[PDB]
Amino acid sequence: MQIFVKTLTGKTITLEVEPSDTIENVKAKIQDKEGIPPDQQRLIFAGKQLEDGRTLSDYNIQKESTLHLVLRLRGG
């Protein structure tokens, strides 16, 4: 199972994930591929921000699903 992650620059990166992986794990993969620390990234899918505790299965993120990587700034 692989999913997609589209950044705000138009780039689309591929991730090798399992349905049991948590949002945290996916953010660690995004960090390994792009370098952004987890606390600085925000993942959107199906209209909602993905929380750390949940799994991909909890959101019905199927094969080849598209995630949206967006900013998670602190105070400006």
Partner: protein
Amino acid sequence: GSHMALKRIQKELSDLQRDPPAHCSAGPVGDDLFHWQATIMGPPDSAYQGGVFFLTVHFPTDYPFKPPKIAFTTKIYHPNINSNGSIKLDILRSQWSPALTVSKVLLSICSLLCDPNPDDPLVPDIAQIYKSDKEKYNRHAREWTQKYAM
């Protein structure tokens, strides 16, 4: 309200005119003292050297008790400055004080160019490049300076 703020602004401008600063230029665009333009020169020894960076400065009607709204007009490659000119800097919000002036903000932005704050960034990508690949950072900043600010 606006008379008070306009008086404070007139004082700051008179100080800039009486002892111009080495670190920037600043002044009203026309006859509206609430709307200023500023310029900072690429700091020497930094990746921005040789470039000219234009800032827009807008005084609120409650100035000096509300911070001034300062943004970049010239494109720059920086961790705390994005593509449309927004700035992430404490004194421009949470740490503003009426004792401070636009001159000191522009000073702090010069220092910010020479020493970014990548641990609380506005552009995560550039921040990580700055922290883990300084050479790449200086390369991109020099390129953008040659392309936009010269």
